[PDB]
Design a protein around this ligand. Sequence first.
Ligand SMILES: OC[C@H]1O[C@@H](O[C@@H]2[C@@H](O)[C@H](O[C@@H]3[C@@H](O)[C@H](O[C@@H]4[C@@H](O)[C@H](O[C@@H]5[C@@H](O)[C@H](O[C@@H]6[C@@H](O)[C@H](O)O[C@H](CO)[C@H]6O)O[C@H](CO)[C@H]5O)O[C@H](CO)[C@H]4O)O[C@H](CO)[C@H]3O)O[C@H](CO)[C@H]2O)[C@H](O)[C@@H](O)[C@@H]1O
Length: 241
Amino acid sequence: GTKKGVSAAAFSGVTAALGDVGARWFYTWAADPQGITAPAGTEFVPMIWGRDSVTADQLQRAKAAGSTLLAFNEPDLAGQANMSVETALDLWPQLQATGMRLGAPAVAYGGDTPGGWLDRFMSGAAARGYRVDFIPLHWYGGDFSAAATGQLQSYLQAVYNRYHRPIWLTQYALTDFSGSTPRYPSAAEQADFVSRSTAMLNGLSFVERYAWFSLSTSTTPTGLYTGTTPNSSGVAYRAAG
Ligand SMILES: OC[C@H]1O[C@@H](O[C@@H]2[C@@H](O)[C@H](O[C@@H]3[C@@H](O)[C@H](O[C@@H]4[C@@H](O)[C@H](O[C@@H]5[C@@H](O)[C@H](O[C@@H]6[C@@H](O)[C@H](O)O[C@H](CO)[C@H]6O)O[C@H](CO)[C@H]5O)O[C@H](CO)[C@H]4O)O[C@H](CO)[C@H]3O)O[C@H](CO)[C@H]2O)[C@H](O)[C@@H](O)[C@@H]1O
């Protein structure tokens, strides 16, 4: 339906790639499309990335560029938004005051863990009477087998069962970051996971939207397209619902 989206950046060919792959929505990790011209039928979803992203200007730009707002990117990691739950909660009224459908900050991991970043954020928000409309998640699988899709499914289910909010999957791929250098699947393994994972996600009623990381090989080695040419993963993503 309207689930299948992507993360994107303004490479030459971006408008053509977005249209080619059938992306119904996209985001850029910023408050506006960052120089991307969307094709017809493709919705831009703004993001407030971190603490210093929360300004009158970014929030006004966000509301002009879209109608759904993603909050901070991986506050739980020192290399990303690097924000305590309490700082996220104290900033939340400024995002909530936009009136837009509002995503939780996207935690890198452990969204189902009692006492973890999300769990303390959701508990604090409930106690303050704040609105959290949906939960975006991130997941990178280290097992490159046919078992990967069921592992992804179990994490999304776990988060759904804990908070009972609709789920978005805003960054996902196969990548192992457990070693000193990232480890990536073979092309065939990655295309097979694209096919199985999208079929699962399309059938899971509490998943609203999903976004493969990422549209371009200029962003990441798990990219779907190089310029306007899909690889076997882009072809599989194109063929997904
Ligand atoms: O607005 C003012 C503000 O602007 C910012 O600029 C924006 C810029 O920050 C943004 O950058 C994008 C970037 O966020 C994004 O990063 C991804 C990253 O999320 C990904 O992280 C992974 C984790 O996901 C992974 O988690 C693991 C998990 O899956 C597994 O299940 O469990 C593990 C258990 O712990 C777990 O760790 O862990 C690894 C290893 O640590 C992380 O690497 O990593 C990818 C790959 O490197 C990284 O790409 O990437 C986007 C694409 O590059 C960037 O775009 O981009 C915006 C638009 O350009 C900018 O506006 C400034 O940075 C702030 O300073 C400003 O104040």
